[PDB]
mmCIF file of all heavy atoms in Angstrom:
data_model
loop_
_atom_site.group_PDB
_atom_site.id
_atom_site.type_symbol
_atom_site.label_atom_id
_atom_site.label_comp_id
_atom_site.label_asym_id
_atom_site.label_seq_id
_atom_site.Cartn_x
_atom_site.Cartn_y
_atom_site.Cartn_z
ATOM 1 N N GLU P 3 7.356 -2.794 -17.621
ATOM 2 C CA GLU P 3 5.925 -3.014 -17.426
ATOM 3 C C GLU P 3 5.378 -1.992 -16.425
ATOM 4 O O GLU P 3 5.745 -1.997 -15.242
ATOM 5 C CB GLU P 3 5.614 -4.445 -17.004
ATOM 6 C CG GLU P 3 4.120 -4.718 -17.111
ATOM 7 C CD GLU P 3 3.767 -6.030 -17.796
ATOM 8 O OE1 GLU P 3 4.645 -6.923 -17.903
ATOM 9 O OE2 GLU P 3 2.595 -6.163 -18.216
ATOM 10 N N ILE P 4 4.510 -1.107 -16.922
ATOM 11 C CA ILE P 4 3.891 -0.028 -16.165
ATOM 12 C C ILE P 4 2.380 -0.188 -16.246
ATOM 13 O O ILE P 4 1.845 -0.500 -17.313
ATOM 14 C CB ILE P 4 4.315 1.349 -16.712
ATOM 15 C CG1 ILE P 4 5.835 1.534 -16.570
ATOM 16 C CG2 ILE P 4 3.506 2.471 -16.038
ATOM 17 C CD1 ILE P 4 6.411 2.765 -17.310
ATOM 18 N N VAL P 5 1.704 -0.047 -15.108
ATOM 19 C CA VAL P 5 0.242 -0.049 -15.039
ATOM 20 C C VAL P 5 -0.219 1.315 -14.543
ATOM 21 O O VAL P 5 0.165 1.741 -13.448
ATOM 22 C CB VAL P 5 -0.274 -1.165 -14.112
ATOM 23 C CG1 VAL P 5 -1.804 -1.104 -13.974
ATOM 24 C CG2 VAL P 5 0.190 -2.535 -14.598
ATOM 25 N N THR P 6 -1.038 2.000 -15.339
ATOM 26 C CA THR P 6 -1.645 3.257 -14.935
ATOM 27 C C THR P 6 -3.162 3.286 -15.142
ATOM 28 O O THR P 6 -3.793 4.312 -14.868
ATOM 29 C CB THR P 6 -0.961 4.435 -15.652
ATOM 30 O OG1 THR P 6 -1.007 4.238 -17.063
ATOM 31 C CG2 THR P 6 0.500 4.533 -15.225
ATOM 32 N N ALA P 7 -3.760 2.210 -15.650
ATOM 33 C CA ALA P 7 -5.214 2.105 -15.723
ATOM 34 C C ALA P 7 -5.692 1.665 -14.340
ATOM 35 O O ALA P 7 -5.993 0.501 -14.090
ATOM 36 C CB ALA P 7 -5.636 1.124 -16.811
ATOM 37 N N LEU P 8 -5.740 2.625 -13.424
ATOM 38 C CA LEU P 8 -5.873 2.392 -11.995
ATOM 39 C C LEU P 8 -6.805 3.425 -11.388
ATOM 40 O O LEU P 8 -6.916 4.542 -11.905
ATOM 41 C CB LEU P 8 -4.509 2.486 -11.298
ATOM 42 C CG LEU P 8 -3.482 1.434 -11.679
ATOM 43 C CD1 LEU P 8 -2.147 1.789 -11.061
ATOM 44 C CD2 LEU P 8 -3.968 0.064 -11.170
ATOM 45 N N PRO P 9 -7.522 3.071 -10.310
ATOM 46 C CA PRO P 9 -7.626 1.719 -9.748
ATOM 47 C C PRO P 9 -8.423 0.784 -10.650
ATOM 48 O O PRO P 9 -9.080 1.262 -11.559
ATOM 49 C CB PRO P 9 -8.374 1.944 -8.429
ATOM 50 C CG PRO P 9 -9.125 3.199 -8.617
ATOM 51 C CD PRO P 9 -8.241 4.062 -9.492
ATOM 52 N N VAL P 10 -8.331 -0.522 -10.423
ATOM 53 C CA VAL P 10 -9.163 -1.501 -11.115
ATOM 54 C C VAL P 10 -10.364 -1.782 -10.211
ATOM 55 O O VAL P 10 -10.175 -2.352 -9.127
ATOM 56 C CB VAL P 10 -8.398 -2.799 -11.405
ATOM 57 C CG1 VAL P 10 -9.308 -3.796 -12.134
ATOM 58 C CG2 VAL P 10 -7.100 -2.516 -12.195
ATOM 59 N N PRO P 11 -11.577 -1.387 -10.590
ATOM 60 C CA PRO P 11 -12.750 -1.716 -9.760
ATOM 61 C C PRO P 11 -13.059 -3.203 -9.853
ATOM 62 O O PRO P 11 -13.223 -3.746 -10.945
ATOM 63 C CB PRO P 11 -13.867 -0.856 -10.361
ATOM 64 C CG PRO P 11 -13.430 -0.620 -11.789
ATOM 65 C CD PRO P 11 -11.926 -0.566 -11.764
ATOM 66 N N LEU P 12 -13.068 -3.871 -8.706
ATOM 67 C CA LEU P 12 -13.420 -5.281 -8.620
ATOM 68 C C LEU P 12 -14.498 -5.459 -7.558
ATOM 69 O O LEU P 12 -14.443 -4.836 -6.497
ATOM 70 C CB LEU P 12 -12.207 -6.138 -8.257
ATOM 71 C CG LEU P 12 -11.029 -6.176 -9.226
ATOM 72 C CD1 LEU P 12 -9.947 -7.140 -8.714
ATOM 73 C CD2 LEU P 12 -11.511 -6.546 -10.630
ATOM 74 N N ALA P 21 -14.604 -2.274 -5.223
ATOM 75 C CA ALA P 21 -13.461 -1.831 -4.447
ATOM 76 C C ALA P 21 -12.324 -1.424 -5.383
ATOM 77 O O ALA P 21 -12.141 -2.034 -6.436
ATOM 78 C CB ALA P 21 -12.988 -2.946 -3.513
ATOM 79 N N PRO P 22 -11.566 -0.375 -5.059
ATOM 80 C CA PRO P 22 -10.486 0.059 -5.964
ATOM 81 C C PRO P 22 -9.203 -0.720 -5.714
ATOM 82 O O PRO P 22 -8.553 -0.559 -4.675
ATOM 83 C CB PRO P 22 -10.333 1.551 -5.636
ATOM 84 C CG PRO P 22 -10.806 1.686 -4.199
ATOM 85 C CD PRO P 22 -11.766 0.543 -3.921
ATOM 86 N N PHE P 23 -8.797 -1.513 -6.708
ATOM 87 C CA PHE P 23 -7.616 -2.365 -6.608
ATOM 88 C C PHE P 23 -6.453 -1.709 -7.354
ATOM 89 O O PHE P 23 -6.637 -1.129 -8.428
ATOM 90 C CB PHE P 23 -7.893 -3.764 -7.185
ATOM 91 C CG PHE P 23 -8.504 -4.738 -6.189
ATOM 92 C CD1 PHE P 23 -9.851 -4.679 -5.886
ATOM 93 C CD2 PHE P 23 -7.735 -5.706 -5.571
ATOM 94 C CE1 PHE P 23 -10.418 -5.547 -4.980
ATOM 95 C CE2 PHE P 23 -8.306 -6.589 -4.664
ATOM 96 C CZ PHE P 23 -9.645 -6.508 -4.370
ATOM 97 N N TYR P 24 -5.270 -1.742 -6.747
ATOM 98 C CA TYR P 24 -4.048 -1.274 -7.396
ATOM 99 C C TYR P 24 -3.101 -2.406 -7.766
ATOM 100 O O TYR P 24 -2.307 -2.258 -8.696
ATOM 101 C CB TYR P 24 -3.335 -0.249 -6.497
ATOM 102 C CG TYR P 24 -4.171 1.014 -6.314
ATOM 103 C CD1 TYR P 24 -5.032 1.146 -5.239
ATOM 104 C CD2 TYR P 24 -4.125 2.052 -7.246
ATOM 105 C CE1 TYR P 24 -5.819 2.285 -5.075
ATOM 106 C CE2 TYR P 24 -4.896 3.187 -7.098
ATOM 107 C CZ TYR P 24 -5.736 3.297 -6.002
ATOM 108 O OH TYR P 24 -6.507 4.411 -5.841
ATOM 109 N N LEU P 25 -3.179 -3.539 -7.081
ATOM 110 C CA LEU P 25 -2.484 -4.756 -7.471
ATOM 111 C C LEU P 25 -3.517 -5.863 -7.578
ATOM 112 O O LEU P 25 -4.313 -6.057 -6.654
ATOM 113 C CB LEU P 25 -1.398 -5.152 -6.457
ATOM 114 C CG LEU P 25 -0.254 -4.149 -6.227
ATOM 115 C CD1 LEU P 25 0.704 -4.699 -5.175
ATOM 116 C CD2 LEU P 25 0.450 -3.900 -7.540
ATOM 117 N N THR P 26 -3.543 -6.546 -8.712
ATOM 118 C CA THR P 26 -4.422 -7.693 -8.879
ATOM 119 C C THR P 26 -3.581 -8.920 -9.201
ATOM 120 O O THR P 26 -2.460 -8.811 -9.698
ATOM 121 C CB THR P 26 -5.467 -7.472 -9.986
ATOM 122 O OG1 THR P 26 -4.813 -7.298 -11.241
ATOM 123 C CG2 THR P 26 -6.310 -6.233 -9.720
ATOM 124 N N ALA P 27 -4.170 -10.096 -8.957
ATOM 125 C CA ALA P 27 -3.432 -11.355 -9.024
ATOM 126 C C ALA P 27 -2.854 -11.626 -10.408
ATOM 127 O O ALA P 27 -1.865 -12.350 -10.532
ATOM 128 C CB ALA P 27 -4.348 -12.512 -8.614
ATOM 129 N N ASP P 28 -3.461 -11.086 -11.458
ATOM 130 C CA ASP P 28 -3.025 -11.377 -12.814
ATOM 131 C C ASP P 28 -1.970 -10.407 -13.336
ATOM 132 O O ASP P 28 -1.434 -10.638 -14.422
ATOM 133 C CB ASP P 28 -4.229 -11.337 -13.750
ATOM 134 C CG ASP P 28 -4.977 -10.012 -13.645
ATOM 135 O OD1 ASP P 28 -5.641 -9.793 -12.603
ATOM 136 O OD2 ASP P 28 -4.855 -9.168 -14.564
ATOM 137 N N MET P 29 -1.654 -9.336 -12.605
ATOM 138 C CA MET P 29 -0.682 -8.367 -13.104
ATOM 139 C C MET P 29 0.706 -8.979 -13.199
ATOM 140 O O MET P 29 1.098 -9.815 -12.376
ATOM 141 C CB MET P 29 -0.606 -7.141 -12.194
ATOM 142 C CG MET P 29 -1.805 -6.259 -12.256
ATOM 143 S SD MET P 29 -1.593 -4.845 -11.174
ATOM 144 C CE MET P 29 -3.178 -4.065 -11.396
ATOM 145 N N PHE P 30 1.465 -8.522 -14.206
ATOM 146 C CA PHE P 30 2.890 -8.821 -14.326
ATOM 147 C C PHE P 30 3.160 -10.320 -14.414
ATOM 148 O O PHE P 30 4.171 -10.812 -13.906
ATOM 149 C CB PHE P 30 3.682 -8.219 -13.160
ATOM 150 C CG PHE P 30 3.433 -6.753 -12.941
ATOM 151 C CD1 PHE P 30 3.042 -6.283 -11.696
ATOM 152 C CD2 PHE P 30 3.616 -5.843 -13.969
ATOM 153 C CE1 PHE P 30 2.814 -4.937 -11.481
ATOM 154 C CE2 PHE P 30 3.384 -4.485 -13.766
ATOM 155 C CZ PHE P 30 2.987 -4.033 -12.514
ATOM 156 N N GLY P 31 2.260 -11.073 -15.033
ATOM 157 C CA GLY P 31 2.466 -12.503 -15.078
ATOM 158 C C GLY P 31 2.099 -13.239 -13.811
ATOM 159 O O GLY P 31 2.347 -14.447 -13.720
ATOM 160 N N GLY P 32 1.533 -12.553 -12.824
ATOM 161 C CA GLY P 32 1.071 -13.242 -11.628
ATOM 162 C C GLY P 32 1.646 -12.684 -10.345
ATOM 163 O O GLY P 32 2.866 -12.594 -10.194
ATOM 164 N N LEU P 33 0.774 -12.330 -9.403
ATOM 165 C CA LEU P 33 1.234 -11.777 -8.137
ATOM 166 C C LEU P 33 0.699 -12.611 -6.979
ATOM 167 O O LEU P 33 -0.388 -13.178 -7.078
ATOM 168 C CB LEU P 33 0.780 -10.322 -7.969
ATOM 169 C CG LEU P 33 1.460 -9.268 -8.846
ATOM 170 C CD1 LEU P 33 0.885 -7.893 -8.508
ATOM 171 C CD2 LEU P 33 2.991 -9.302 -8.696
ATOM 172 N N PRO P 34 1.454 -12.734 -5.888
ATOM 173 C CA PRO P 34 0.979 -13.497 -4.732
ATOM 174 C C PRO P 34 0.082 -12.700 -3.801
ATOM 175 O O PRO P 34 -0.306 -13.220 -2.748
ATOM 176 C CB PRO P 34 2.289 -13.890 -4.031
ATOM 177 C CG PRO P 34 3.193 -12.747 -4.301
ATOM 178 C CD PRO P 34 2.832 -12.248 -5.696
ATOM 179 N N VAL P 35 -0.236 -11.450 -4.145
ATOM 180 C CA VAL P 35 -1.128 -10.609 -3.354
ATOM 181 C C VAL P 35 -2.018 -9.822 -4.304
ATOM 182 O O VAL P 35 -1.709 -9.641 -5.487
ATOM 183 C CB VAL P 35 -0.381 -9.619 -2.411
ATOM 184 C CG1 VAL P 35 0.464 -10.364 -1.390
ATOM 185 C CG2 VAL P 35 0.475 -8.614 -3.212
ATOM 186 N N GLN P 36 -3.143 -9.366 -3.760
ATOM 187 C CA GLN P 36 -3.970 -8.334 -4.351
ATOM 188 C C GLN P 36 -4.097 -7.226 -3.326
ATOM 189 O O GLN P 36 -4.054 -7.471 -2.119
ATOM 190 C CB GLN P 36 -5.357 -8.883 -4.746
ATOM 191 C CG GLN P 36 -5.235 -10.167 -5.537
ATOM 192 C CD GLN P 36 -6.468 -10.506 -6.317
ATOM 193 O OE1 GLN P 36 -6.682 -9.988 -7.417
ATOM 194 N NE2 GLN P 36 -7.279 -11.412 -5.778
ATOM 195 N N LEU P 37 -4.232 -6.001 -3.801
ATOM 196 C CA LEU P 37 -4.116 -4.852 -2.913
ATOM 197 C C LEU P 37 -5.165 -3.854 -3.340
ATOM 198 O O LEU P 37 -5.162 -3.404 -4.490
ATOM 199 C CB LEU P 37 -2.703 -4.258 -2.984
ATOM 200 C CG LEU P 37 -2.129 -2.938 -2.417
ATOM 201 C CD1 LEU P 37 -3.094 -1.812 -2.215
ATOM 202 C CD2 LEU P 37 -1.183 -3.111 -1.208
ATOM 203 N N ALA P 38 -6.053 -3.517 -2.415
ATOM 204 C CA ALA P 38 -7.158 -2.611 -2.665
ATOM 205 C C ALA P 38 -7.208 -1.582 -1.553
ATOM 206 O O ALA P 38 -6.705 -1.807 -0.460
ATOM 207 C CB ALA P 38 -8.500 -3.364 -2.721
ATOM 208 N N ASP X 55 11.911 -9.167 -7.667
ATOM 209 C CA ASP X 55 11.175 -8.085 -8.292
ATOM 210 C C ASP X 55 10.705 -7.100 -7.230
ATOM 211 O O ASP X 55 10.378 -7.475 -6.099
ATOM 212 C CB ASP X 55 9.953 -8.607 -9.051
ATOM 213 C CG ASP X 55 10.307 -9.527 -10.209
ATOM 214 O OD1 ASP X 55 11.498 -9.650 -10.577
ATOM 215 O OD2 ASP X 55 9.358 -10.095 -10.787
ATOM 216 N N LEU X 57 7.950 -3.761 -6.929
ATOM 217 C CA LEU X 57 6.904 -2.942 -7.532
ATOM 218 C C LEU X 57 6.936 -1.571 -6.882
ATOM 219 O O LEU X 57 6.995 -1.465 -5.652
ATOM 220 C CB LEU X 57 5.514 -3.575 -7.371
ATOM 221 C CG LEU X 57 5.382 -5.079 -7.670
ATOM 222 C CD1 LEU X 57 3.932 -5.547 -7.476
ATOM 223 C CD2 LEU X 57 5.906 -5.468 -9.065
ATOM 224 N N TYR X 58 6.942 -0.528 -7.707
ATOM 225 C CA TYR X 58 6.691 0.823 -7.242
ATOM 226 C C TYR X 58 5.202 1.080 -7.331
ATOM 227 O O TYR X 58 4.598 0.870 -8.382
ATOM 228 C CB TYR X 58 7.444 1.860 -8.073
ATOM 229 C CG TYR X 58 8.921 1.976 -7.753
ATOM 230 C CD1 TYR X 58 9.832 2.342 -8.732
ATOM 231 C CD2 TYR X 58 9.398 1.726 -6.477
ATOM 232 C CE1 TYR X 58 11.191 2.460 -8.448
ATOM 233 C CE2 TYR X 58 10.764 1.829 -6.177
ATOM 234 C CZ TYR X 58 11.649 2.202 -7.172
ATOM 235 O OH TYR X 58 12.995 2.324 -6.899
ATOM 236 N N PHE X 59 4.618 1.509 -6.226
ATOM 237 C CA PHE X 59 3.200 1.841 -6.150
ATOM 238 C C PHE X 59 3.096 3.300 -5.722
ATOM 239 O O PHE X 59 3.391 3.640 -4.570
ATOM 240 C CB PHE X 59 2.492 0.901 -5.178
ATOM 241 C CG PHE X 59 1.078 1.297 -4.854
ATOM 242 C CD1 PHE X 59 0.256 1.871 -5.819
ATOM 243 C CD2 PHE X 59 0.566 1.062 -3.580
ATOM 244 C CE1 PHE X 59 -1.059 2.207 -5.500
ATOM 245 C CE2 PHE X 59 -0.735 1.411 -3.249
ATOM 246 C CZ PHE X 59 -1.549 1.981 -4.209
ATOM 247 N N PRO X 84 -2.294 7.711 -9.994
ATOM 248 C CA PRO X 84 -1.799 6.455 -9.418
ATOM 249 C C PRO X 84 -1.050 5.626 -10.451
ATOM 250 O O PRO X 84 -1.476 5.590 -11.591
ATOM 251 C CB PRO X 84 -3.090 5.740 -8.979
ATOM 252 C CG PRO X 84 -4.105 6.203 -9.975
ATOM 253 C CD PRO X 84 -3.724 7.627 -10.361
ATOM 254 N N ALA X 85 0.024 4.946 -10.057
ATOM 255 C CA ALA X 85 0.824 4.193 -11.008
ATOM 256 C C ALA X 85 1.498 3.047 -10.282
ATOM 257 O O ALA X 85 1.827 3.148 -9.094
ATOM 258 C CB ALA X 85 1.887 5.060 -11.692
ATOM 259 N N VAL X 86 1.674 1.942 -10.998
ATOM 260 C CA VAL X 86 2.401 0.788 -10.489
ATOM 261 C C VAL X 86 3.406 0.376 -11.546
ATOM 262 O O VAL X 86 3.048 0.251 -12.719
ATOM 263 C CB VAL X 86 1.467 -0.389 -10.152
ATOM 264 C CG1 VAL X 86 2.298 -1.540 -9.671
ATOM 265 C CG2 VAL X 86 0.426 0.011 -9.104
ATOM 266 N N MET X 87 4.668 0.197 -11.148
ATOM 267 C CA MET X 87 5.716 -0.144 -12.100
ATOM 268 C C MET X 87 6.508 -1.326 -11.573
ATOM 269 O O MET X 87 6.929 -1.323 -10.413
ATOM 270 C CB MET X 87 6.652 1.041 -12.361
ATOM 271 C CG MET X 87 7.763 0.734 -13.398
ATOM 272 S SD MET X 87 8.694 2.221 -13.868
ATOM 273 C CE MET X 87 9.876 1.533 -15.015
ATOM 274 N N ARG X 88 6.716 -2.328 -12.415
ATOM 275 C CA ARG X 88 7.480 -3.507 -12.019
ATOM 276 C C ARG X 88 8.950 -3.341 -12.397
ATOM 277 O O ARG X 88 9.273 -3.031 -13.548
ATOM 278 C CB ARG X 88 6.922 -4.763 -12.679
ATOM 279 C CG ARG X 88 7.789 -5.987 -12.428
ATOM 280 C CD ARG X 88 7.196 -7.209 -13.077
ATOM 281 N NE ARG X 88 8.016 -8.392 -12.839
ATOM 282 C CZ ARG X 88 8.850 -8.902 -13.738
ATOM 283 N NH1 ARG X 88 8.953 -8.345 -14.937
ATOM 284 N NH2 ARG X 88 9.576 -9.971 -13.442
ATOM 285 N N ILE X 111 7.391 -2.559 -3.154
ATOM 286 C CA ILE X 111 6.867 -3.880 -2.795
ATOM 287 C C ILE X 111 7.790 -4.942 -3.385
ATOM 288 O O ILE X 111 7.795 -5.174 -4.602
ATOM 289 C CB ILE X 111 5.422 -4.072 -3.267
ATOM 290 C CG1 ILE X 111 4.539 -2.957 -2.689
ATOM 291 C CG2 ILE X 111 4.907 -5.471 -2.869
ATOM 292 C CD1 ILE X 111 3.144 -2.934 -3.246
ATOM 293 N N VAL X 113 8.576 -8.583 -4.185
ATOM 294 C CA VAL X 113 7.690 -9.715 -4.445
ATOM 295 C C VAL X 113 8.468 -11.018 -4.414
ATOM 296 O O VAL X 113 9.385 -11.216 -5.221
ATOM 297 C CB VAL X 113 6.981 -9.581 -5.799
ATOM 298 C CG1 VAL X 113 6.069 -10.793 -6.012
ATOM 299 C CG2 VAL X 113 6.217 -8.279 -5.885
#
Side-chain angles (χ1 to χ4, degrees):
Chain P
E3 193 134 18
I4 298 170
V5 176
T6 55
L8 295 172
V10 180
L12 297 183
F23 274 79
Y24 295 93
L25 299 179
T26 63
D28 55 288
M29 289 181 183
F30 308 126
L33 288 181
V35 298
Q36 311 199 82
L37 170 334
Chain X
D55 297 350
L57 315 181
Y58 283 150
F59 170 36
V86 179
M87 182 171 179
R88 173 179 180 259
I111 304 172
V113 180

